[PDB]
From Swiss-Prot:
Keyword Cell division part of the UniProt annotation: no
Similarity-based family: Belongs to the IAA-amido conjugating enzyme family.
Function: Indole-3-acetic acid-amido (IAA) synthetase that catalyzes the conjugation of amino acids to auxin specifically using the auxin precursor indole-3-butyric acid (IBA) and glutamine and, possibly, cysteine as substrates. Displays high catalytic activity with the auxinic phenoxyalkanoic acid herbicides 4-(2,4-dichlorophenoxy)butyric acid (2,4-DB) and to some extent 2,4-dichlorophenoxylacetic acid (2,4-D) as substrates, thus conferring resistance to herbicides.
GO annotation, cellular component aspect: cytosol
Loss of function: phenotype: No visible phenotype in normal conditions. Slight reduction in root length when grown on media containing indole-3-butyric acid (IBA). Hypersensitivity to the auxinic phenoxyalkanoic acid herbicide 4-(2,4-dichlorophenoxy)butyric acid (2,4-DB).
Source organism (scientific name): Arabidopsis thaliana
Molecular function (Gene Ontology), one example: ATP binding
GO biological process: auxin conjugate metabolic process
Residues that hold ATP according to the record: S97, S98, T297, F320, Y321, G322, S323, S324, E325, Y343, D390
Name listed for the protein in its UniProt record: Indole-3-acetic acid-amido synthetase GH3.15
Amino acids binding substrate: F320, F327
């Protein structure tokens, strides 16, 4: 647990963060003893430990598990069995996660104490942000987030996202500009995005930070602005909400900010939105914002160049490393280069072990710099030695606390037969290849992929949506550069792929298909119409569903094949 502290006392908060990252071994051992002692009579723990609370019996007798191994406990609680199947405290909500098992979202128990500890630690960490980001304390955080539905279990437990649970709790015991639909559901995402942007624009002079779950989340906001800014501004000029907004939360709530006709504010926003280039639009619309906070690591690293284009120099920050299962780390250097983000594990948030990636698990303090690990977390909400499914690389120490860079999920995205191409390798390959377009004033906006086993020999298909700065005439890549892009992806894949191409002969030439602009919004709307969470949506890096494939296939303009065979010993 975390000690009592004054969140208004910035020096006391920073001094506590130093303590927390210095006494790492002692805090970890304290956390473990507390979890094992308090949960000793749960059905889950007693079956393995029979009352022991010492670390060595823990390591010997408690198995390392995945969500698949423990799902039955969660389902039984969802059906009405008591929280003490897994936890000595009541389960207050189930969290719907991104990442599945299988093929639905994981449902993760959360206790009220765990939730308040996470909120507590967030207020412990904000003074560091304020110390690093001048002016951040001077205004509000405009957070682009909304929820379109929620549910409850058979026994009546609420099912929510972690963000909603986080916001709802700090709201119930208090600086944030958050949409009326971050907590209260609205099925119409058009109404919810409209009201949230209207509020954000009305409050633009009070906004010190922009936030969203992911880097790509901002592109959906910007796309909506491109289509609807004149109507938004018209509402600001007249002080009158457009009458097609029927959602009761927006219509009853909007009067708080839409207080009177404001022609001058409307004209200011129109002046920015009517410019040809939307470069720096985010800073121009929110000129007092001090940073843009979202996940920019892993798959989201792909959107950094485009988000920086819209950012006008606002630093892109990624402050937090966490999951439904556990809040895990923070960035002690929030203004670092987005490519240099590392997260320091916070020892009081759980007991953290690490599985070497390449059966061998080490304690947090025994991690090896430069080696890859999957976190194995033991928590205060009924998870014990639970595999989180991320791969982190240990990069150093903040005081005595290891810090890690996010490598990726552990996920095969493409496989013709014995080739198993992982998401992190495909991402690095596409990163290498898309660089070749920079001399031609072209940018890769998004991509996905599929295995084409139709014919003779199977091969990878990568779908590329391209854009540029010229809105005046057609843009198009020459075939020579596209063909070298194909090769550069291939040369970046692993030895099994490359041996397949050069030696084995069972893998054919990689293919890049350029899709028309808007292809990846059509793809997204396809998944949304089938129940995907809007706020948790990420472009999947490969697609198998036949209706999504048919969507990508009829957006295809040009196709290109690698003309060179990749190298391999
Ligand atoms: O750790 C995480 O996964 C994200 O946590 C948060 C941090 C800050 C704010 Cl404002 C909201 C949330 Cl959900
Ligand atoms: O921006 C902020 O205020 C804190 O970070 C977040 C807040 C809300 C959401 Cl959804 C995602 C992120 Cl990364």
């Amino acid at each position: 647990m975390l000690p009592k502290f004054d969140p208004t006392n910035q020096k006391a908060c920073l001094s506590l963060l130093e303590d927390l990252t210095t006494n790492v071994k002692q805090i970890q051992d304290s956390v473990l003893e507390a979890i094992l002692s308090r949960n000793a009579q749960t059905e889950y723990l007693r079956g393995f430990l029979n009352g022991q609370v010492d670390k060595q019996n823990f390591k010997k007798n408690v198995p390392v598990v995945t969500y698949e191994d423990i799902r039955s406990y969660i389902d039984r609680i969802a059906n009405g069995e008591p929280s003490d199947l897994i936890c000595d405290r009541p389960i207050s909500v189930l969290l719907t996660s991104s990442g599945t098992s299988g093929g639905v979202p994981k449902l993760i128990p959360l206790t009220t104490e765990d939730l308040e500890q996470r909120i507590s630690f967030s207020s412990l960490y904000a003074p560091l942000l304020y110390k690093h980001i001048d002016g951040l304390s001077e205004g509000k955080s405009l957070i682009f987030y909304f929820v379109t539905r929620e549910s409850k279990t058979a026994n009546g437990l609420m099912v929510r996202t972690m963000v909603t649970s986080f916001l709802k709790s700090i709201k119930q015991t208090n600086s944030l500009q958050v949409s009326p639909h971050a907590i209260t559901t609205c099925a119409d995402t058009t109404q919810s995005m409209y009201c949230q942007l209207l509020c954000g624009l009305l409050e633009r002079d009070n906004v010190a930070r922009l936030g969203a779950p992911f880097a790509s989340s901002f592109l959906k906001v910007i796309k909506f602005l491109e289509d609807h800014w004149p109507e938004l501004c018209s509402n600001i000029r007249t002080g009158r909400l457009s009458d097609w907004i029927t959602d009761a939360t927006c219509t009853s709530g909007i009067g708080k900010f839409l207080t009177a006709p404001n022609p001058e504010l409307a004209s200011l926003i129109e002046q920015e939105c009517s410019k040809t280039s939307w470069e720096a639009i985010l800073k121009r619309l929110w000129p007092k914002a001090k940073c843009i906070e979202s996940i920019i690591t892993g798959t989201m690293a792909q959107y950094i160049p485009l988000l920086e284009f819209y950012s006008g120099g606002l630093p892109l920050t990624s402050s937090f490393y966490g999951s439904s299962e556990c809040f895990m780390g923070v960035n002690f250097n929030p203004l670092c280069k987005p490519s240099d983000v590392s997260y320091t594990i916070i020892p009081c948030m759980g007991y953290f072990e690490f599985l070497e990636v390449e059966p061998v698990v080490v304690d947090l303090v025994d991690v090896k710099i430069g080696h890859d690990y999957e976190p194995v977390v033991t928590t205060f909400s009924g998870l014990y030695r639970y595999r989180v499914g991320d791969v982190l690389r240990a990069t150093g120490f903040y005081n005595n606390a290891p810090h890690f860079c996010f490598v990726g999920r552990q996920k095969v995205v493409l496989s013709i037969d014995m080739d198993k191409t992982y998401e992190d390798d495909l991402l690095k390959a596409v990163t290498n290849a898309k660089l070749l377009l920079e001399p031609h004033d072209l940018m890769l906006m998004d991509f996905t992929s599929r295995v084409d086993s139709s014919s003779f020999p199977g091969h990878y298909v990568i779908y590329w949506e391209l854009g540029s700065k010229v809105k005046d005439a057609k843009f198009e890549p020459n075939r020579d550069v596209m063909e070298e892009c194909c090769f550069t992806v291939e040369e970046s894949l692993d030895a099994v792929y490359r041996k397949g191409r050069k030696n084995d002969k069972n893998i054919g030439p990689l293919e890049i298909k350029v899709v028309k602009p808007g292809a990846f919004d059509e793809l997204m709307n396809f998944f949304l119409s089938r129940g995907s969470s809007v706020s948790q949506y990420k472009t999947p890096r490969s697609v198998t569903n036949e209706e999504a494939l048919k969507i990508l296939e009829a957006n295809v303009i040009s196709e290109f094949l690698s003309r060179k065979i990749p190298s391999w010993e």
